[PDB]
Design a protein around this ligand. Structure first.
Ligand SMILES: CC(C)[C@@H](C)/C=C/[C@@H](C)[C@H]1CC[C@H]2C3=CC=C4C[C@@H](O)CC[C@]4(C)[C@H]3CC[C@]12C
Length: 418
């Protein structure tokens, strides 16, 4: 445990990051299943061609009782990969595991053809895992357009970025682009100063709509750069032409190919050392013991087992919106767990969900109109837009106050949106 890792771990404990997380993770929903009718997606969308996800009104069959804030937290489902990454002295092998971490969060998107809640302006969501030593926090920093800012911290790695989802139904497919930059910091166990990786997430689309069998597809190219070394990785999510294929190549700073990896992003990813730096070889689509330098293949990631849950949620997703008894007294009034329309929907009370949604959305609009009448500039509570010193891009800088003020029971009047 390096000095900087211990210094980070000490901060996390002093700020009380795990207070209130004593309850065992939620294992299921009160709903055992549910019988929202299987309305045809085309029948709904044919009258809304060219619209955005947020401008559409959808039946509950195409809603999910999670927030966009919580879908972004599903980036962390396989965060163990990042501690593994920190343990490798070879920077290109750290990059391999960082890359596969970025791929690992797409298995959970399958079988959830549904719109998550559009977070209210100022809505927040926190999630800490004492068993993993990380804390995640996010604030909805914009409503027009919808933007979430995140900030995740752990002894060996940080992860933060902007969720800016730009969507469009073109009459055939529903397309989603992720416009924000993501920042992943590793504090290596050895042989390396703290290092910064950046990348943008792949696109997603709903296809099969006209065929009557909607399917979530993730597609496009991703490039991860290590700003310190500076290794880089190219990732290719193949677009549907039922192929879930993903492949990637990891290069050192001189363009030498060091690693390739590939698999199906709904199932598993394997990798191998590339022995000749100029090889054109890419992963063709049996050691489960860790990395290998001799060129044999090794497993890196496999999807978690996925029981049947209402709304087709994953086990990990079931933990996120849990109103855990020991957690509730710590939360700000803005936390997604307290959001009443989303809570009603999770419990299968769909008319209550529609009733509460109308109320909280009306109040949001009225507060915006009052601000505009008084020339009042909206200010985020927990983030401020700044210029990042390395990328020179605008980013949402966490102000460092949330967890300390939470520790000190100072949140009771930090927002009133539900
Ligand atoms: C009419 C309905 C069916 C339309 C709007 C719903 C489309 C779904 C499939 C879209 C809507 C929002 C999309 C969405 C938003 C945010 C992220 C966070 C990112 O880190 C992983 C992908 C992910 C999770 C994607 C996956 C695909 C989602 C969930």
């Amino acid at each position: 445990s390096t000095a900087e890792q211990k210094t980070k771990a000490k901060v996390l404990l002093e700020e009380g990051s795990f207070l209130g997380y004593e309850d065992k993770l939620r294992q299921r929903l009160k709903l055992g299943k549910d019988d929202r009718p299987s309305v045809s997606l085309w029948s709904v969308l044919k009258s809304m061609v060219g619209k955005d996800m947020t401008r559409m009104t959808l039946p509950v069959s195409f809603n999910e009782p999670t927030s966009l804030l919580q879908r972004v937290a599903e980036d962390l489902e396989y965060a163990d990969l990042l501690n593994q990454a920190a343990s490798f002295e070879d920077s290109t092998l750290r990059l391999l595991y960082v890359a596969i971490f970025t791929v690992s969060s797409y298995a959970s998107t399958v079988k959830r053809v549904a719109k998550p809640f559009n977070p209210l302006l100022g809505e927040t969501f926190e999630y800490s895992r004492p068993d993993k030593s990380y804390r995640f926090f996010t604030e909805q920093v914009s409503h027009h357009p919808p933007i979430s800012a995140t900030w995740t911290e752990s002894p060996k790695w940080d992860f933060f970025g902007e969720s800016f989802v730009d969507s469009k139904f073109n009459g055939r497919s529903f397309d989603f682009k992720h416009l924000g930059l993501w920042y992943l910091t590793i504090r290596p166990d050895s042989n390396g100063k703290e290092e910064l990786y950046t990348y943008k997430k792949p696109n997603n689309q709903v296809v099969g709509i006209l065929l009557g069998n909607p399917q979530v597809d993730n597609y496009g190219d991703v490039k991860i750069v290590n700003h310190n070394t500076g290794d880089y990785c190219m990732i290719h999510f193949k677009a549907r032409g039922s192929a879930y294929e993903v492949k990637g190549e990891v290069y050192n700073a001189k363009g030498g190919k060091e690693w390739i990896f590939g698999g199906r992003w709904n199932e598993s990813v394997s990798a191998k050392k590339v022995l000749k730096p100029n090889s054109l070889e890419e992963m063709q689509v049996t050691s489960s013991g860790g990395p290998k330098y001799d060129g044999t293949r090794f497993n890196v990631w496999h999807v978690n087992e996925r029981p049947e849950f209402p709304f087709n949620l994953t086990k990990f997703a079931v933990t996120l919106n849990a109103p855990q008894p020991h957690l509730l007294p710590w939360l700000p009034p803005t936390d997604t767990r307290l959001r009443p329309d989303q809570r009603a929907m999770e419990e299968g009370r769909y008319d209550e969900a529609a009733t509460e949604k109308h109320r909280v959305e009306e109040r949001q609009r009225s507060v915006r109109k009052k601000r505009e009448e008084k020339n009042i500039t909206y200010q985020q509570r927990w983030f401020k837009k700044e210029i990042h010193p390395v990328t020179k891009c605008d980013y949402w800088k966490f102000n460092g106050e949330y967890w300390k003020q939470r520790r000190d029971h100072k949140l009771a009047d930090e927002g009133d949106i539900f």
